[PDB]
Structures are given as structure tokens and as C-alpha cells.
Design a protein around this nucleic acid. Structure first.
Length: 673
RNA sequence: UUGUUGUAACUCUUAUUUUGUAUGGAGUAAACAACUAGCAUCACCUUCACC
DNA sequence: GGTGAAGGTGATGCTACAAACGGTCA
DNA sequence: TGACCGTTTG
């Protein structure tokens, strides 16, 4: 837009306020409410005029600004006879759109802007903060607005209705309005050596169709878009997000200066003068770790969290991160049925800083006397390779049964395993080692908090059923269980438990990543779980337990924290396909298709002979440690952009069918019995 | 100990089966790890009332 | 099995300005 | 009058 980043990243730091010179909690809350009200009214105005001629807005510009650059574009022949939503597209000039819409809002004055509570100057608060925020939100809504034409695979060779639908999809989904931009994209595609002619045939055919069919395709696209936007509820602003955004001017006074005691003073314009506690990553012993003094942006955010006022200062900081080599790849099978992070590393006892819980659970005198043969075999198999956070779900359910009074088979080994974990925690407490003790306590706390989350969420469901029963539809649809006092208390408990679960999971992930860094590994591989693949469903309690507590750990987000760690770390993270890692044999690297997930049936083991989780981890590692398999499946990320929160390598496979078709061509297939 | 979050040890305390190996509360206490945030939209899942 | 509300997760997209003009007060 | 800083324009 107006800020450009080159080999750098914009980092936002939230600072807790202290000595707020008149910026009280109630006053800031009222100011935030007024800001949200103004934003909502402007969004409503944008909605009500969204399917309206652009050149009609020219009548709103004041006479003294008729010769302005942006006003001329309003009545220019290119956009003279187009609906207003067309300015929220790549073709239209962004700055002209912003200025023209701001002028229309100011002249119309659909909300009586008499001034805000905090007495910010009008330019920032109105023109730059909320009007610009609303315009940017409507841009991000309209730009990729899919009229409902679902893309289909059999592509060009079909009927004329197919041609129409696919041309609409291709013009819209990537945001095209003009033929010139489309021709520029075709030139870009033809410049690239990697043709991929299968899609190129479709692209060229629909380009040729669009060449001589502009009038009716434009008319039908406009009609479909208008139809979609009539029933659009508008970019409304939620009331549960207490926040306010301000943008300073080019010459505005916005100075941040140290005031001793690891504190900072923020002085913006003339109506803002506050002090902030500081942060351990920006200031350390009165010394600065980031160039916040002379690198901070001109925009800040005032927000309230837990009835505490924060201010967000964002700074452009250098970010030198490269793609990671693959001289030593670590595969991680993220399946949380038994453990949390399976790994393809054999545990020979020479992994520096690694504690194997499974190794010292099967070597515990008290545990041997209780665990049956099958579980003992499970734990002997797991202990042979590196693994993290033993998370036996049936064990948590047995604990739930113990609490609820229902007998369960695993009850004795529950106490046994917990006693082993506590013994490990105390051994590491007395030994003085910090990281291992942190890991052990995090595993124990996470195990307890998943059960707590399940209990509290089941109680939430039961209480919602109790309160909602026998009431009118209007009464419950306007006064839901979420916003009542009992509901808000329950959701507060849920949020606390969720935060603690996320914290323990992040600590475990960081421990694993530190282990990988110390051991000399260079690359980390995970499945690209775009969403929870297990998100679909007396034993109803067990099923709900398992499902909601899959959802609680942020099962698909576990990779995201791995990339977050890789940002400042020295090991890269890749997202490999999640369609066939659990089915590939790891000896000959082939696939059993004749597929079906029921391969892992014999005592939690694979037909190959190795353990199922170990097999999947080995497959995930192999996807990246072999050049051929990477080139087949794995596309290196763009090194010209920023690698912050971006994998070093990532898949271009979007469905199971494409993957299974891709395997067959080069081999990698076998037949089951 | 200069922010948020997760993780200790130690001394008390009702309360909580709407966190019973855990949490709220009071006191004390230290090292180690992460932290790009805001706003809007879309998709999906779950629960609940209804048929 | 869907229609509505709520909760949440996951993904996406804009955005975090630069330079010039003009009002005002020492 | 020049010098901050709120306002207007790409």
C-alpha cells in the first residue's frame, strides 16, 4: 500500500500503560465505543451505496477540490459507468479511492462527527484511523468476493455454461476487472519456464474467450456481484473487541523516550502523554534491543485486555532469515492419541538434553507391577525412538472416571504413571536441571488441563441445555447463553484453561525445537494440516471428550508455532502432504494401495514391522531428505519475499486425488493382501 | 521482576466437582522460553432450541 | 438430517506513509 | 516571519 518492506519485518509490541495522565479505563472504554459507532455508521454508508455508479459520487466533492487528482478519476470514462464496488479492486488507484471516499463521507456526513472523547486531532482519528480502516476492510471483503461459482476439475473441454462459469471464476478469484491486467498475467505466466501445461490449456482457452466476449462477461459478472452484495450484511464491527486505532501524520509529534527504570514514555501529538512498563525483548537493563526510538511507525493501537490498558507500537526491525538446508531432516508425526510428537530419531541414549519419559516409565518398579502386557508392549515400542509428551487419552478419561465415581480398567496404572511423572519432576528439581524439569511439569500440567477443559466444556453444554430448554425462540436468540453472567463465567474458565493448555503445548514444542537445534539437526518436517482432519464426529461422553480435546490443543496450529520458533531459530520447518505419510512403508518408500487408515491395527503397529507413529515420522522425514521426493511434492517458498512465519518449503498439493495421481507416475506403489 | 503467557520450589486458607495430580485467594520467591499486532471477511466444526 | 444463535479454529487480506500546503502563534 | 503541526493529495 503506502508502506513497503524489503528484507525487513514490521513487529508490533504491546506495552502495558502506567501513569496514564487522565487516560482512565472508563474514559478509554467510552472512546472505544464511540470509535466503533463511527466505524459502524461509515460501514453502513459504504454498504448502502455499494452498488452505485462511481461517477455519481463526483457530485459530493466540494467545488474547490473538483480539479483534484482523485476527483477526476471519479468521472473518467474508464470508471464513469461502473458500480462503486469496482474501486475496491486491484485496478483502481488505492490513494484516489481513499481520498474520494473520505471526501464523500465528509460532505455527506452520514454520522455527525462532532469530535471524539480523547480529543485526538480530526485528521488522524477520522481520516486516517477509522475511515481508512473501514475502506481497507471493504477492500479485503470486495476484492476476493466469490459470487459462488465453484471451480471444477474437468476444466475447459465442456459446454458453454462451463466456459462462462470458469471465466467468471478466473476473472474474480484472483481479482481482475480489466483486460490489460489479464494480459499482463498471461505474459507473466508465459515468461515462467515452469509451464504446467495442464492448467495452461485452460488459462489460454479462457483468455481467448475473454478476448472477444468482454461485454457479456462483464455484464454477467456485475450482475452476480450485485446479487451477492445485496444480501451482504456489511463489514460490521464486533462489540466484544475493545480497541481503537490511530494513525499519526507525517509531521506529527510522536516521540518515545526512555525515562529510566526500564520504562518508556510515549508522547503523541498534544493530547497523549503516557508511560509504559516496558518489555523484555525491546528494553533490557535500560538498554534497547530494537530501534523503537527512531523506527517506530506512525500508527498505534489503544486496547483494553483484562481491564488493563495497552498501547501497540510497531517497528520495522531487520530480519535476516534464509531457507534451511536439508543435510539432517527431522520428521515429526503429530498424532496425539498416545504421545504428542513422534519422531524418526532412534533413541540410543546419545541425544543431548533429551529425557525419555517412556524409557523411564517401563524401568519403574511400581509401574511394572500394574501395567498389562499390551500397554507394556506399547510403551516399550514408543521408548525406542525420540518422542515428546506422553499424552495417553484413555488415561485422562480414566482420571475422569475416577473423579466421576465410574470404575475404569486403567485406574491403577493411572496413579502409577502419574507417580512416575512426579518422580521425574522431583528428580529434575533436585538435580538442578532447568529445561528437563520445565518439560516434565509442562507435560503433567497439560495432561491435567486437557481433562479440566473437557470437564468444564461438558458442563457448559449441560448448562446451556438446561437454561435454553423451554424458552421462546426470540428470547434465546436475543439473550443467548454466551452473554449471560453464568455463561460469561463459564467462558472465562474456558479461556483460562485454553491459555494454559496453549502455554504448556508451546513450552513442549520449544523444548523439542531446542533439542533439535542442540543435536545438530538442520531441517524440521511436519504434515500440512490446513485444518483438523479429526474435526468431524454412555460413550457419547468419550467421543465428545476426544473431539473437543483434539480441538483444544490447536492440533493444526502445532506446525505454526514450529515456524514461529524457526523464525529466530537455526532450523527450518516444512509442511509436507498429510495424505499418505501414514500409509508409506519406510523401508522401500512405497505405498500400499488396493488407501485405508485401518492399516495400524496390530497393537498400534504397521504392516511394515516398525511402529505406526515411527513409520509416519520416517515417511515425513523422507519427504524432505530425498531430493526427488521434494521436487515431486515440495515447492520452495519465495525467497524474494519475507520468510517470517513462512515455511522454508511447502506443498503445492491441495487434495488427496492430486497426490495419489502424482505418486503413480514415478512408481511408489505396492499391493496389499 | 520492566509487559502478556506457560512453567517451579516454599507457608497458610475457606471455596470450586460449572478446572479435585487442578484452579481461584493471601504471602514469599528465581530462572527460561516464546511473543507482529490490530481490524474485517470467508470456510468449517461443535453445542443448544426447533421442527 | 437442516435453520437459527452462540462458541471456536484456520485462512485470507489491508495496514502500520511520504511529501507538500496551509493555519496559527511566538 | 518561521516553525510547528494539523490537513490534503499521490
Amino acid at each position: 500500500h503506502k508502506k513497503t518492506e524489503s528484507n525487513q519485518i514490521i513487529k508490533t509490541f504491546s506495552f502495558k500503560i502506567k501513569n496514564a495522565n487522565g487516560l482512565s479505563l472508563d474514559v478509554l472504554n467510552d472512546a472505544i465505543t464511540e470509535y466503533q459507532n463511527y466505524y459502524n455508521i461509515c460501514s453502513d454508508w459504504i454498504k448502502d451505496h455499494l452498488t452505485m455508479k462511481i461517477s455519481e459520487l463526483y457530485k459530493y466533492i466540494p467545488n474547490e477540490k473538483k480539479n483534484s487528482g482523485y476527483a477526476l478519476t471519479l468521472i473518467s470514462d474508464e470508471w464513469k459507468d461502473k458500480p462503486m464496488y469496482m474501486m475496491f479492486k486491484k485496478g483502481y488507484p488505492a490513494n484516489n479511492r481513499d481520498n474520494a471516499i473520505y471526501e464523500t463521507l465528509n460532505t455527506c456526513n452520514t454520522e455527525h462527527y462532532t469530535g471524539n472523547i480523547l480529543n485526538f486531532s480530526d485528521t488522524y482519528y477520522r481520516r486516517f484511523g477509522y475511515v481508512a480502516s473501514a475502506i481497507s476492510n471493504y477492500v479485503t471483503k470486495i476484492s476476493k468476493m466469490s459470487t459462488g461459482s465453484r471451480s471444477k476439475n474437468i476444466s475447459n473441454d465442456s459446454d458453454v455454461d462451463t466456459i462462462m462459469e470458469q471465466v467468471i471464476y478466473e476473472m474474480e478469484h484472483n481479482g481482475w476487472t480489466s483486460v490489460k491486467d489479464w494480459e499482463n498475467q498471461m505474459e507473466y505466466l508465459e515468461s515462467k519456464t515452469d509451464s504446467n501445461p495442464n492448467f495452461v490449456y485452460r488459462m489460454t482457452t479462457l483468455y481467448e474467450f475473454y478476448k472477444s466476449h468482454i461485454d457479456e462477461v462483464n455484464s454477467k459478472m456485475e450482475t452476480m456481484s450485485i446479487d451477492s452484495l445485496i444480501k451482504f450484511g456489511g463489514c460490521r464491527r464486533k462489540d466484544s473487541k475493545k480497541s481503537m486505532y490511530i494513525m499519526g501524520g507525517s509531521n506529527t509529534p510522536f516521540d518515545i523516550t526512555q525515562i529510566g527504570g526500564n520504562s518508556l514514555n510515549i508522547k503523541f501529538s498534544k493530547n497523549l502523554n503516557v508511560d509504559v512498563f516496558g518489555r523484555y525483548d525491546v528494553i533490557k537493563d535500560n538498554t534497547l534491543l530494537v530501534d523503537i526510538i527512531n523506527g517506530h511507525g506512525a500508527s498505534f493501537v489503544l486496547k483494553i485486555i483484562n481491564d488493563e490498558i495497552y498501547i501497540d507500537i510497531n517497528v520495522s526491525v531487520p530480519f535476516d532469515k534464509k531457507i534451511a538446508t536439508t543435510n539432517k531432516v527431522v520428521g515429526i508425526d503429530v498424532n496425539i492419541k498416545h504421545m504428542l510428537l513422534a519422531t524418526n530419531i532412534l533413541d540410543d541414549g546419545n541425544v543431548k538434553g533429551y529425557v525419555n519419559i517412556y524409557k523411564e516409565v517401563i524401568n519403574d518398579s511400581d509401574f511394572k507391577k500394574v501395567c498389562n502386557s499390551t500397554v507394556m508392549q506399547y510403551f516399550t515400542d514408543f521408548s525406542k525412538f525420540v518422542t515428546f509428551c506422553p499424552l495417553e487419552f484413555d488415561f485422562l478419561f480414566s482420571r475422569v472416571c475416577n473423579q466421576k465415581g465410574i470404575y475404569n480398567d486403567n485406574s491403577a496404572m493411572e496413579k502409577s504413571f502419574s507417580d512416575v511423572l512426579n518422580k521425574l519432576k522431583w528428580n529434575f528439581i533436585e538435580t538442578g536441571d532447568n529445561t528437563k524439569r520445565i518439560y516434565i511439569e509442562n507435560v503433567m500440567k497439560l495432561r491435567s488441563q486437557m481433562k479440566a477443559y473437557a470437564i468444564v466444556k461438558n458442563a457448559y453444554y449441560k448448562q446451556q441445555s438446561e437454561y435454553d430448554f423451554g424458552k421462546s425462540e426470540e428470547f434465546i436468540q436475543e439473550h443467548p447463553f454466551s452473554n449471560t453472567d453464568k455463561g460469561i463465567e463459564i467462558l472465562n474458565k474456558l479461556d483460562n484453561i485454553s491459555k494454559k493448555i496453549l502455554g504448556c503445548r508451546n513450552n513442549i514444542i520449544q523444548y523439542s525445537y531446542n533439542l533439535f537445534e542442540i543435536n545438530g539437526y538442520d531441517m524440521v518436517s511436519l504434515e500440512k494440516l490446513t485444518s483438523s482432519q479429526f474435526k468431524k464426529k454412555l460413550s457419547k461422553f468419550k467421543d465428545d471428550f476426544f473431539n473437543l480435546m483434539i480441538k483444544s490443543i490447536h492440533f493444526a496450529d502445532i506446525k505454526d508455532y514450529f515456524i514461529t520458533l524457526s523464525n529466530n531459530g537455526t532450523a527450518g520447518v516444512s509442511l509436507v502432504p498429510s495424505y499418505f505419510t501414514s500409509q508409506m512403508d519406510s523401508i522401500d518408500h512405497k505405498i500400499y494401495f488396493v488407501n485405508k487408515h485401518k492399516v495400524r491395527s496390530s497393537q498400534e503397529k504397521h504392516i511394515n514391522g516398525l511402529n505406526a507413529d515411527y513409520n509416519a515420522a520416517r515417511n515425513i522425514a523422507y519427504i524432505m531428505e530425498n531430493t526427488d521426493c521434494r521436487n515431486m511434492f515440495m515447492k520452495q517458498s519465495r525467497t524474494d519475499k519475507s520468510l517470517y512465519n513462512k515455511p522454508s518449503y511447502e506443498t503445492f498439493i491441495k487434495t488427496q486425488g492430486s497426490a495419489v495421481a502424482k505418486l503413480k507416475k514415478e512408481g511408489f506403489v505396492k499391493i496389499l493382501d
